[PDB]
Write a protein that binds this ligand. Structure first.
Ligand SMILES: C[S@@+](CC[C@H](N)C(=O)[O-])C[C@H]1O[C@@H](n2cnc3c(N)ncnc32)[C@H](O)[C@@H]1O
Length: 93
RNA sequence: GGCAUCGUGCCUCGCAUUGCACUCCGCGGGGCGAUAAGUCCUGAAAAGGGAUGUC
């Protein structure tokens, strides 16, 4: 869909603890660019999914194209662009 | 430290969940101030932290 600073990742293994997931996502995705923040909740609506906020869209695009489907804690990651700017990014625009 | 109450969030099990958030709580059982986390609180920010009542 329309390119965004923030990639939306779901199909994540819901048994990973909040901290380990967040840092794993940071460790993996920081090759593709500078990460402003990563947002992870284990709530019913928000489990199995994460927002990764890149500083540059080029990183997000390259991240999404390159990591798509990657086996991650025994599930393949599904990556889409976020439907919407993260507050941290829009608060700048 | 103990009682009792409330804010905040974390871990864990069963069942359920593929879910687009930053305005944030699946139901049920268990364990929690703890250099964790926090959406709550202090502070102008860096940062720091449960609070109230009670013996
Ligand atoms: C009434 S319970 C809170 C339950 C929670 N508010 C809920 O919706 O299920 C109070 C107890 O939870 C524990 N607790 C709540 N917040 C905590 C925190 N941030 N850190 C450590 N323990 C906490 C404490 O052990 C306290 O004795």
């Amino acid at each position: 869909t329309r390119p965004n600073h923030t990639i939306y990742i779901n199909n994540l293994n819901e048994k990973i603890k909040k901290d380990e997931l967040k840092k794993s996502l940071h460790a993996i995705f920081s090759r593709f660019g500078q990460i402003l923040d990563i947002l992870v909740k284990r709530s019913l609506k928000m489990r199995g999914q994460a927002f990764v906020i890149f500083k540059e869209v080029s990183s997000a695009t390259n991240a999404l194209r390159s990591m798509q489907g990657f086996p991650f804690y025994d599930k393949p990651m599904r990556i889409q662009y976020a439907k919407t700017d993260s507050d941290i990014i829009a608060k700048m625009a």
